[PDB]
Write a protein that binds this ligand. Structure first.
Ligand code: B12
Ligand code: B12
Ligand code: FWK
Ligand code: FWK
Lengths: 137, 483, 483, 137
């Protein structure tokens, strides 16, 4: 795969870290330059990193359930920061509790996320989607 | 304040209290005089410390779930359901993650959004925002002892509110509620702030109010070697006892090999009592809590019961005083009250199917206990050496030098050098030792156990095995065997 | 025919075969020469005896459900679901109760009523009515070995049909498929008819066709003391070996105390091998099967998983070759394929969470094994004495005199005098000995263990405790404590 | 005097016996004369015992699920044998599989049974119902 840069982080007041280490490992192995801002990351940290590194995509991980709050407004802040059209992915355990997945997916797509991932998504699925979205399959 | 493992004076503690209570307006509801009277009116059946004494005397394992939502009435209805339909022996109130980061402004917004949505947008109960009045309403609505369960580096105000609210146990400690739960908090600062929480319980005990404290054994819930987990728990018990705490539940998170897990819990209890008495704390009542599998769960609910109930069998045969209940929703999200009651019912059924049964002693168990005690002693010995006898200072320097090192901890004060992996029977071992201060004999034993897995699987032991072990249980088995 | 523990001659057996095949028109589908060639073309992966050897070699416990419905297509769909969605390692076909009483007229009516109703009104698969043709269709539609599981005093025609049908294991024996399953069948007649079933397997083995036989350990499923259960199983293994059987799985039903259950299964396997070799049967491959709790189940499905998975943990640590899976519908009715797959998935998850783990030896385990072996030897020694060296005659006389006595057996040839009950740790003991030929030392140990329960509960040991124990698990616990 | 007599048994090709022993024990302790015909009992055995002992009730236990077949026609045979209005109870696990209980209860009432009992019914419920129906409570 041709080299591209992503920002990777866990949003909000969320301290879950193991999935972040695995995602970094997997996307690096797939050929991406992973800019990993780590856990407990406000939206601004994702945007600062994407600007500094000219990132092609921002992968927001959210495990603790309060991402439904934390994730609102990221697209708008990205637009205002000059990142129009950047890919925004969100995945993990992104709402509080088991819910009807089509409802969750629409709720986050309506927030401006390009792709929205359910619990237990293998990193390989996001890698394949990213290659397709960046046209580097 | 300077960090020293020494009981705070009454004056130093009072000075800190007056600062802490100003951190949110609900701090005004805390009146220590009035709270002591309120606490002493709680029936013994609803006092967490006294019920732990009862469990220990009767030789039974008590089951306790995790539970919490944004709104008060919904939270009470949830706990009543776990009590009545689930049959819980103890009740939690699990604190939301904004409270854990002291962001009570975000708690308040989450409360309002939860009211609008008709469902909890918070992942727990915002106890500081609900204040003493809200926390008392929870206690008065239930018939079981209540414990704050959370993960908060700076829990000082939370502790004031929940204890004045009649909750007679607080979980946590300066290591176990920092390293798994924070990225930027110094070990010195979390140890100082947990001295406050311990010293508050010390004040209550001095008035004759009995309140339990529970260090968070499982840490990151991800392949934590028993000797490192136990070193933390023993340390937090010793640091709590110095501030006056008298009723302590030390904890351990299941690794999955039954003999290793039973060895771990027995070593934890034995060495906790041994160290407390060696340092002059002769009136501490110690109990144990076994956490059902804290790693990734299988999403299939029948497989989830496989994990819940095998874990409960290990706890029962270990003689644990308490077992923390997982639910079939673990892989997906915060459990419904029904999924939680399902987990409690399966757990208590397993406990009652094993009434009075204990794992008898064996050569295998004796050998594993000797390994765990010797590894734990290496770590604690070095901590006391680094601290020149002061275990609190020794803990700070142990983290600075990688002597104490927690797998996958987000804290930037964690070295992140030690690497765990399972051996051929599934026991968690040390793959890379980093700066953990083991003797050559102790390192050799880990290596010999791990070589048996390399031989059986036909691959060298490696970080790829660690990844395999991180995913194994969610994929249906204990050991991450090659696909 | 006269009963003797002597291999039937080829001529005697053939004479009986030609009578048996006339008992229903599907007997005409049985062609022994053709069936041998059919059986030899079954791949090893679908041969029950050969897969048992593989499990023993790999030290793994295989999971097997129970399953059966009236109609062929529906039964195949059911087994495929348990295979694919459940992950079963072995497949059953559970025979309906009309077939078990040789009432093939009632099977046929039940087939017609099941077609009309769109659901099975039979409680199993009518294998005699479906014939060799139908049993082969089942085998050819699945990817796992198939075993007839049932409860049939006169199973001669059934065995001919299912073995010619490619099913490479038959469960049962002349005691274990009589006393729990019949009222009016003499022990002599069921032993004679099960000699036929064993002699048919003996014929197949002489042609080089490997077929497993499984005596039914759990018997009445109701507080059966290990030594009485094990005496039956060893007897049925010996009687089968004399007729030429070479691959035998001896079984045991969970009593619930983990150490007693592990002791029971280990004693069963060790003494089965010891007795086989003592009597000159030197080429018999012995495996074990552990049955999850065969007594009354709790109705709550979460509590049911508590029983299923604790049972599986005992089986895994005992080193069982096979475990039979209960479902969360046990208290209510024949499980749906979904409830059955749920039980299998929880069972296999538990097995995989315990991979390679075994209960280590302890003084407690060593003591219980010595008790069980000594009790079992008392019973077998007396049987051989009564038979003047012939175990089959000794079994008849043992039932006539109460030396062998199965709790709650409906057979009028069962004395019904021995009475079991649990001790204070939940171990099943002898409350009333009847004519079971124990020494005073053995009786006194039972009494001493039971006195501990009297002391703890504050009531005399009694039949009321027996009733309490019969209901206890369905009411949420192992031991029938006073309310 | 007025000691009441019941016939107790397990119907059809069913060999389950533990519940029969418990029911015999419980109803005997409650003061009934229990005529226990045991397991594997065809309908005709219940009727022959009811005639010979002038029974006030027949308690049919059915555990193995095929009672939905076996139990049909008992009331009619009881009428034809001169046992009009004898009490007929049926309980145990009387159909194959978990089913909607009100539907099961009606199906067996439609066969002529006076009372119909779900899985797990305590003997004490049947004792209380029988004392009420016989006006001996
Ligand atoms: C281990 C664990 C812990 C450890 C974490 C240690 C640490 N610092 O990392 C401890 C015990 C400390 C912990 C704490 C808590 N936890 Co926790 N935790 C887990 C657990 C059991 C496994 C997580 C894990 O590490 N899995 C292994 C890694 C490899 O997988 P992963 O994290 O799922 O990430 C993978 C996939 O999700 C996917 N993925 C993730 N993000 C993304 C993004 C994209 C774009 C893509 C393509 C893929 C992708 O790929 C990742 C790599 O394989 C899960 C439940 C489970 N899964 O069984 C609960 C869970 C995540 N925890 C949960 C909660 C609520 C908590 C707390 C927030 C409690 C609270 N009320 O505050 C706290 C944390 C406090 C805080 N400030 O956030 C909930 C979330 C609830 C919800 N969403 O409804 C869960 C789901 C449990 C539950 N069912 O209730 N936890
Ligand atoms: C132990 C047991 C066995 C033992 C029985 C030994 C024996 N001979 O007694 C063994 C292992 C041999 C056995 C065999 C089989 N069993 Co079985 N057995 C059970 C089990 C686990 C418990 C039964 C028991 O003894 N309970 C304790 C006694 C005290 O309670 P009880 O029998 O339920 O009876 C009480 C209540 O029902 C009530 N009651 C009962 N009848 C009546 C009547 C009246 C009028 C009233 C008021 C009350 C009442 O009061 C009783 C006393 O408290 C049950 C499942 C469960 N309950 O968890 C399955 C169960 C009854 N078995 C079942 C089956 C199908 C079989 C077989 C028929 C298999 C087959 N396909 O042929 C065979 C029997 C062969 C034959 N010819 O009938 C099924 C029935 C399925 C259905 N109805 O849909 C059950 C429900 C399991 C299941 N979920 O599939 N079994
Ligand atoms: C990895 C967090 C662990 O704690 C549990 N937990 C955290 N918050 C809650 C909560 N609010 N309700 C019920 N369980 C909870 C969660 O299910 C998981 O087992
Ligand atoms: C006490 C009979 C035992 O065997 C099981 N059993 C008997 N017949 C079937 C059957 N036809 N399908 C599934 N399980 C069955 C039943 O669930 C119970 O566990």
């Amino acid at each position: 795969m041709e080299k591209k840069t992503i920002v990777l982080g866990v949003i909000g007041s969320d301290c879950h870290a193991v999935g972040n280490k695995i995602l970094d490992h997997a996307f690096t192995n797939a050929g991406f330059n992973v800019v990993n801002i780590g856990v407990l990351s406000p939206q601004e940290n994702f945007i600062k990193a994407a600007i500094e590194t000219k990132a092609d995509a921002i992968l927001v991980s959210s495990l603790y359930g309060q991402g439904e709050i934390d994730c609102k407004g990221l697209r708008q802040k990205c637009d205002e920061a000059g990142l129009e059209g950047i890919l925004l992915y969100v995945g993990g355990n992104i709402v509080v509790g088991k819910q009807h997945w089509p409802d969750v997916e629409k709720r986050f797509k309506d927030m401006g996320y390009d792709r929205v991932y359910a619990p237990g998504t293998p990193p390989e699925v996001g890698i394949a989607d990213l290659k397709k979205d960046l046209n580097i399959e | 304040m300077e960090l020293k493992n020494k009981k705070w004076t009454d004056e130093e503690f009072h000075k800190q209290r007056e600062e802490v209570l100003q951190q949110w307006p609900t701090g005004k509801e805390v009146d220590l005089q009035e709270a002591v009277d309120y606490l002493k009116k709680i029936p013994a059946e609803k006092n967490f410390a006294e019920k732990l004494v009862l469990a220990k005397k009767k030789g039974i394992t008590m089951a306790q779930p995790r539970a919490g939502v944004a709104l008060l009435d919904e939270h009470i209805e949830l706990l009543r359901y776990l009590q009545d339909e689930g049959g819980a022996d103890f009740l939690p109130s699990t604190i939301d993650a904004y409270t854990r980061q002291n962001r009570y402004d975000e708690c308040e917004n989450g409360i309002k959004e939860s009211e609008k949505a008709g469902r909890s947008l918070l992942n727990g109960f915002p106890g500081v925002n609900h204040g003493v009045k809200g926390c008392r309403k929870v206690l008065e609505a239930v018939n079981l002892p209540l414990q704050a369960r959370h993960g908060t580096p700076d829990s000082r105000l939370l502790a004031e509110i929940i204890h004045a609210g009649g909750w007679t146990s607080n979980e946590g400690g300066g290591i176990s509620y920092n390293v798994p739960y924070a990225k930027n908090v110094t070990i010195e600062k979390s140890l100082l702030d947990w001295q406050y929480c311990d010293r508050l319980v010390g004040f209550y005990e001095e008035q004759g109010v009995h309140i339990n404290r529970e260090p968070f054994g499982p840490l990151t819930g991800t392949l934590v070697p028993p000797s490192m987990s136990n070193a933390v728990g023993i340390t937090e018990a010793l640091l709590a006892a110095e501030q006056g705490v008298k009723n302590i539940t030390v904890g351990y998170g299941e690794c999955g090999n039954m003999i290793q897990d039973i060895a771990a819990l027995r070593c934890l209890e034995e060495q906790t009592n041994e160290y407390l008495k060696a340092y002059g704390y002769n009136d501490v009542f110690v109990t144990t809590v076994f956490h059902q599998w804290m790693g990734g769960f299988p999403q299939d609910e029948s497989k989830a019961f496989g994990v819940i109930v095998t874990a409960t069998t290990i706890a029962a045969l270990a003689g644990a005083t308490k077992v923390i209940v997982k639910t079939p929703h673990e892989a997906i999200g915060i459990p419904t009250k029904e999924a939680n009651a399902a987990g409690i019912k399966a757990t208590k059924m397993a406990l009652n199917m094993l009434e009075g049964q204990r794992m008898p002693m064996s050569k295998e168990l004796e050998t594993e206990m000797a390994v765990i005690k010797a590894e734990t002693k290496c770590i604690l010995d070095k901590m006391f050496e680094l601290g020149k006898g002061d275990l609190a200072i020794g803990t700070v320097k142990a983290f600075e030098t990688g002597v104490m090192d927690i797998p996958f901890g987000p804290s930037k004060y964690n070295a992140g050098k030690m690497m765990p992996v399972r051996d051929n029977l599934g026991c968690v071992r040390y793959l890379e030792f980093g700066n953990v201060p083991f003797t050559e004999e102790i390192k050799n034993y880990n290596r010999e156990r791990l070589q048996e897995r390399a031989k059986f699987e036909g691959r060298d032991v490696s970080f790829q095995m660690v990844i395999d072990d991180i995913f194994a249980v969610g994929k249906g088995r204990l050991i991450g065997r090659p696909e």
